[PDB]
């Protein structure tokens, strides 16, 4: 409960965004008068629709590195990426909406900020790994 | 262990929740023989995918409040929002499938239900952090 | 941290191979030059498409049994599954990108493992509660 109080922070967060980002469908839906089951129609809302479907299939991949990266690496440092990307993800969301070029730049500093989370996380797995198994490999050639 | 076995049952549930409804599109694929890569067809179908997909969508979100509600908050309450919401699903896929009309009411109960965990989230790391934060605001202006 | 190192591994692996999924639908886009928000066009493309967002939609529940499993049954024996599961989903997405009847043989095997990691999940839960609920059964017609 302490030592991942801020993952969980930045969890929160991030499902707030993801909430937000729905609302923001459904609106579309409203404004451009597109009814379930169609998730297709003028380009404005295809964008705002799937700005929403990009980020919420890039979430567990986030929440995933997020924890492992805090849990074996560093809490704040696992956290801060979390915030960085989490804002990289707004942007890119806000950004897709008004047109799919404004996507990229935001979509950009998304995958570095991901690709932080899971180089950290693989820094911090290795770190927990490596060392037992070189100590086992040499044991072995006794 | 102890402490997040009524999470983990009913993180459990919601899983096979999911199964349940991937294989219910699987059966309608074969009814209304739509062969992938296809997502398109007989609105009848096109229904049947959208709620599987729709609670896909979200169940990232509803594992994330929930495991986050139980942790800082309290784990019987959050199992409890999370069987409320699971079942709100259900009758989310099963009254979606019939018409898109009849999914409302369900989506609304699922809302609420995962808003509650939200909330409840949000209260518990209030609850972990406001405290400290305030005090060293204090020991601050010393 | 030491109980979960192993389920975390195949976490990050797993989020890696996500990862491989996205850059490669990406490339589809571009030899096939499909712009989103377009997610339709050659069938070559709709498969690879396609291979990416259905693994996509299986991550969180793949995540979600590979730590309950891990946490009350096995680590080990969830991390194989967990490894079993990642591979048959490698072998889904390619064989799924050449032709979608290849996507089959590798989709059964991913379903096997993922349902071994929820029988093993189901298995390790039961045996958390059970217990303690037939002794309380009994204490309750003493
Ligand atoms: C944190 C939770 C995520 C946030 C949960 C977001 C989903 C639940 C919120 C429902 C808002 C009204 Se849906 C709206 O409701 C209209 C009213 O009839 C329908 O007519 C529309 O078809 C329909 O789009
Ligand atoms: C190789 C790639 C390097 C990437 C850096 C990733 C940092 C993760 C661990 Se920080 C720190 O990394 C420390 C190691 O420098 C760990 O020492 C423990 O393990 C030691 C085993 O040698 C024990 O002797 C020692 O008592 C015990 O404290 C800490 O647990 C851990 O917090
Ligand atoms: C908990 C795990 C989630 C549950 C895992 C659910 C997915 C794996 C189950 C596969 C069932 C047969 Se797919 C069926 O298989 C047919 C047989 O050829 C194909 O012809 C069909 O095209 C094809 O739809
Ligand atoms: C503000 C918004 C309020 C929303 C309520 C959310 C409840 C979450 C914590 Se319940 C309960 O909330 C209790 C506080 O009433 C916590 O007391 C601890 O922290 C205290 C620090 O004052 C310590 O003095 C004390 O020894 C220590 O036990 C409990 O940890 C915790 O289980
Ligand atoms: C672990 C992180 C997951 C891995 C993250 C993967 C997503 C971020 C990687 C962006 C690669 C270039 Se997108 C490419 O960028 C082109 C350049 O203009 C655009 O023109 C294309 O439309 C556009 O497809
Ligand atoms: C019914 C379906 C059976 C499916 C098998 C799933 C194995 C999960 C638990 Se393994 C093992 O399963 C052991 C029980 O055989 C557990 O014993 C504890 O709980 C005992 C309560 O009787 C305590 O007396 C004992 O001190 C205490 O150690 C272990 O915690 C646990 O690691
Ligand atoms: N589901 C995504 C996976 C690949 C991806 O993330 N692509 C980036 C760069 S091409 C994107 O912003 N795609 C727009 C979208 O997914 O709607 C897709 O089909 O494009
Ligand atoms: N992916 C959803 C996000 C918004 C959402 O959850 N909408 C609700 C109320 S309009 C719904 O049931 N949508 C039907 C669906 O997603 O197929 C969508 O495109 O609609
Ligand atoms: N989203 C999936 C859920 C059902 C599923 O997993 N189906 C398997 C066997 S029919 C599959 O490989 N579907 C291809 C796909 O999802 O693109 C769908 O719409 O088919």
């Given at each position: 409960?302490?030592?991942?109080?801020?993952?969980?922070?930045?969890?929160?967060?991030?499902?707030?965004?993801?909430?937000?980002?729905?609302?923001?469908?459904?609106?579309?839906?409203?404004?451009?008068?597109?009814?379930?089951?169609?998730?297709?129609?003028?380009?404005?809302?295809?964008?705002?629709?799937?700005?929403?479907?990009?980020?919420?299939?890039?979430?567990?991949?986030?929440?995933?590195?997020?924890?492992?990266?805090?849990?074996?690496?560093?809490?704040?440092?696992?956290?801060?990426?979390?915030?960085?990307?989490?804002?990289?993800?707004?942007?890119?969301?806000?950004?897709?909406?008004?047109?799919?070029?404004?996507?990229l730049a935001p979509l950009y500093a998304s995958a570095r900020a991901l690709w932080?989370?899971?180089?950290?996380?693989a820094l911090g797995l290795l770190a927990?790994?490596?060392?037992?198994?070189?100590?086992?490999?040499?044991?072995?050639?006794?």
């Open positions: 409960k302490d030592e991942v109080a801020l993952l969980a922070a930045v969890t929160l967060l991030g499902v707030l965004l993801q909430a937000y980002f729905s609302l923001q469908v459904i609106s579309a839906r409203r404004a451009f008068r597109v009814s379930p089951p169609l998730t297709t129609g003028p380009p404005e809302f295809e964008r705002v629709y799937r700005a929403q479907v990009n980020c919420s299939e890039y979430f567990p991949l986030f929440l995933a590195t997020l924890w492992v990266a805090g849990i074996f690496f560093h809490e704040g440092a696992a956290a801060l990426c979390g915030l960085v990307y989490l804002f990289a993800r707004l942007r890119y969301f806000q950004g897709y909406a008004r047109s799919a070029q404004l996507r932080l989370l899971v180089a950290l996380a927990h790994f490596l060392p037992a198994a070189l100590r086992a490999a040499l044991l072995g050639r006794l």
